[PDB]
Design a protein around this nucleic acid. Sequence first.
DNA 1: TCGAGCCGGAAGTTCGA
DNA 2: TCGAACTTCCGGCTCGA
Length: 96
Amino acid sequence: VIPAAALAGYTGSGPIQLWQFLLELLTDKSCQSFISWTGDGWEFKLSDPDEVARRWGKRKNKPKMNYEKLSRGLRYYYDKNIIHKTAGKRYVYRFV
DNA sequence: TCGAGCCGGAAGTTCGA
DNA sequence: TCGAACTTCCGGCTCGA
């Protein structure tokens, strides 16, 4: 249930691109047991990023990273038109 | 009445060409 | 060698039960 490293298998061919990784993990395995992926147009909410949130901080050899970070670094990520957060709730994320 | 998560700004080091 | 890129630290705002 972690086909990320198996799907990616994308080697140390340079650090991955932030959103490309997140976007690759998005349209990936089930995502029903650890998060919520609607089966309609393109809506993505983070229900329980327990494995995602700790993988995010693990890549940096950092043991634990709360989710506030993503609301932090992901927010400042409005540099390119790639992932915009939804003004609906707070754990609702979206991509263009 | 009380706690929790989200956001605002800046600085610092490294990548590919 | 050049410029941009993503990360992390400090402290502050408001909502629901």
